[PDB]
UniProtKB/Swiss-Prot annotation:
The chain holds residues 532 to 900 of 2750 of the full protein. Polyubiquitinated. Polyubiquitination targets ITPR1 for proteasomal degradation. Approximately 40% of the ITPR1-associated ubiquitin is monoubiquitin, and polyubiquitins are both 'Lys-48'- and 'Lys-63'-linked. Phosphorylation by cAMP kinase (PKA) enhances calcium release. Phosphorylation by PKA increases the interaction with inositol 1,4,5-trisphosphate and decreases the interaction with AHCYL1. Inositol 1,4,5-trisphosphate-gated calcium channel that, upon inositol 1,4,5-trisphosphate binding, mediates calcium release from the endoplasmic reticulum (ER). Undergoes conformational changes upon ligand binding, suggesting structural flexibility that allows the channel to switch from a closed state, capable of interacting with its ligands such as 1,4,5-trisphosphate and calcium, to an open state, capable of transferring calcium ions across the ER membrane. Cytoplasmic calcium released from the ER triggers apoptosis by the activation of CAMK2 complex. 1D-myo-inositol 1,4,5-trisphosphate binds at Y36, R37. Ca(2+) 1 binds at R199. Homotetramer. Homodimer. Interacts with ERP44 in a pH-, redox state- and calcium-dependent manner which results in the inhibition the calcium channel activity. The strength of this interaction inversely correlates with calcium concentration. Part of cGMP kinase signaling complex at least composed of ACTA2/alpha-actin, CNN1/calponin H1, PLN/phospholamban, PRKG1 and ITPR1. Interacts with IRAG1. Interacts with CABP1 (via N-terminus). Interacts with TESPA1. A lipid is attached at C301 (S-palmitoyl cysteine). This is Inositol 1,4,5-trisphosphate-gated calcium channel ITPR1. Belongs to the InsP3 receptor family.
Length: 352
């Protein structure tokens, strides 16, 4: 401990079992601060002191995230812009993806979002990223076999060229660099699924300039990618594309109609002819509507429709996407029954 002690080879640490014993300290420290306000305020006084130890792989980041997760009054004031900038800077030198989830979980609490927390993070994510952080998006189509390419820049001032499917295939081969690339890619998709919540336009407009419905759906028609990636693509697609102006929740039952407008005969063929304006909107997700249908075809034939855990993880966000689409008035009454029979087929196969 001359200047300090480093967990790396610079200074002796005697890691592995000793760290296993040490992590109990912060584990029981988190146990103490569960659902107890006074402990939170008592630990809050060390807010400045606890800043430095973050990033030393000593579970200090876990402790600070646990403390900041369940105290909104503490979070709204103690967390500052410089702290977020330091968080961002730590990852670049760390060259590790797992740090990314902690920043994302800051803005989400009690299944809602804090506006000031999202505002202080949107610019702090978009501005430092572009220098060299990795970006890991570079959404350009092969036309712009159609494919998208994941060109990421490392710290060695070098441009890596690789198709998404090829690097995904190499990830299961045993390549650690591509595994970390996919980890950071899924993490940044998860981030991108958070700043766009509950109609805040400090980041939605910027994101929509690169992402498109067909661009994201290109990640829906390929099964080569691991299903966690597609899980991220579905949720970000829902959060940014679906919830935006001008589309809004529709009323199911109408209490006031016009006599002359209603024809003498009403049938399914003319169920909802009052959606002429939204015809383009339906068109730009009509293919998405189709994939929602045949995705259920892909799973009906299974003897156990919930066999694989990764397939289970794939299922939930697609369920959510359709769940939101149906209330957004996207499906005509003819399509509701078509979805209903395939939906009930899964429940029938559940008994097997």
């Amino acid at each position: 401990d001359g200047p300090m002690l480093r967990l790396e080879e610079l200074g002796d640490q005697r890691h592995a079992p000793f760290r296993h014993i040490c992590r109990l300290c912060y584990r029981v420290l988190r146990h103490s601060q569960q659902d107890y306000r006074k402990n939170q305020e008592y630990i809050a006084k060390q807010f400045g002191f606890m800043q430095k130890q973050i990033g030393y792989d000593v579970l200090a980041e876990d402790t600070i995230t646990a403390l900041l997760h369940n105290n909104r009054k503490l979070l709204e004031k103690h967390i500052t812009a410089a702290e977020i900038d330091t968080f961002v800077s730590l990852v670049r030198k760390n060259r590790e993806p797992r740090f990314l989830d902690y920043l994302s979980d800051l803005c989400v609490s009690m299944n809602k979002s804090i506006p000031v927390t999202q505002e202080l993070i949107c610019k702090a994510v978009l501005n430092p990223t572009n220098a060299d952080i990795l970006i890991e998006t570079k959404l350009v189509l092969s036309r712009f076999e159609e494919e998208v390419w994941l060109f990421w820049r490392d710290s060695n001032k070098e441009i890596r060229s690789k198709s998404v499917r090829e690097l995904a295939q190499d990830a299961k081969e045993g390549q650690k660099e591509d595994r970390d690339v996919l980890s950071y890619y899924r993490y940044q998709l998860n981030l991108f699924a958070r700043m766009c919540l509950d109609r805040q336009y400090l980041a939605i407009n910027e994101i929509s300039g690169q992402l498109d419905v067909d661009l994201i759906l290109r990640c829906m028609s390929d099964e080569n990618l691991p299903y966690d990636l597609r899980a991220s693509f579905c949720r970000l697609m829902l959060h940014m594309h679906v919830d935006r102006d001008p589309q809004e929740q529709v009323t199911p039952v109408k209490y006031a109609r016009l006599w002359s407008e209603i024809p003498s005969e009403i049938a399914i063929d003319d169920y909802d002819s009052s959606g002429a304006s939204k015809d383009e909107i339906k068109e730009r997700f009509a293919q998405t509507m189709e994939f929602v249908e045949e995705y259920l075809r892909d799973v009906v034939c299974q003897r156990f429709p919930f066999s694989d855990k990764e397939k289970n993880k794939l299922t939930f966000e697609v369920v959510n996407l359709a769940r939101n689409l149906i209330y957004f008035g996207f499906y005509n009454f003819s399509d509701l029954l078509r979805l209903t029979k395939i939906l009930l087929a899964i429940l029938d196969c559940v008994h097997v």
